[PDB]
Amino acid sequence: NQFVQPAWQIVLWAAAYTVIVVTSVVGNVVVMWIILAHKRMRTVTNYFLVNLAFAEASMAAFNTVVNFTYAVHNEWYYGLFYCKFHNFFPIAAVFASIYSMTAVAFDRYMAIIHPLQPRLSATATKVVICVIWVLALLLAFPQGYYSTTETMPSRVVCMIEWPEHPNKIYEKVYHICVTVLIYFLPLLVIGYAYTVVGITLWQVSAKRKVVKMMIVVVCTFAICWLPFHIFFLLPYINPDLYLKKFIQQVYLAIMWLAMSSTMYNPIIYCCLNDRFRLGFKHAF
């Protein structure tokens, strides 16, 4: 059994993960409390914001901690039912977070470019939230259904036993389809919407701060979500890379890089608006 690490690397990775999980859960539940608890911020505008905050808190509470405790020593510690639940729910949380970000960009585009049109109703907002969560669960279902737990000499592993085929069509088509549905489409949507809004907007300093914020959001999304999909699309091109400790170093690095995208949005909301600054001042 080769997947074992000494003390110092484990200490370094534990600190580097503890910082981001503490910052993510504290910022997201504080922002959710500020919107839901002051009785003047409960507005149709902020529903997608509290949906994104809940999705990011659920994404950073389970999917980072359990994957870290599985990636330290490559052993499973909980059981078959938690293997099923972990392969079902937090991937749907990731999908719901990304589509909530796309919905927020959509409302900002229609608020700035077409101001005279009325904003969407409360029931349409609730239907869009429900469709987002149902689509996330339906996309994350086949990974959690086929998940299983197998024993080996000094190993217990939770894996995804896909149905066998001589050419490996099912998992290849599924991984290519989920790569297209995560990465390429909402990057294009957010890029086009924020490009048009930034071109229109570019008290000039507040508008330039808004344009710089959208540039930061698009750049961090692309740079922090590229190598995650590169690594998960890797083993259909050269599958001999998965038999060394270098690949678990690469996995831990890309997992930190992918889950570092959770902390950015409460910092942005505290930076721009003064009412959110008063909310953080009253909450602390």
């Binding site: 490559n74 990974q143 038999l243």
Partner: peptide
């Protein structure tokens, strides 16, 4: 089942 040296990364 595939190999005793695989890593089995998860999402």
């Amino acid at each position: 089942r595939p190999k005793p040296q695989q890593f089995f990364g998860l999402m």
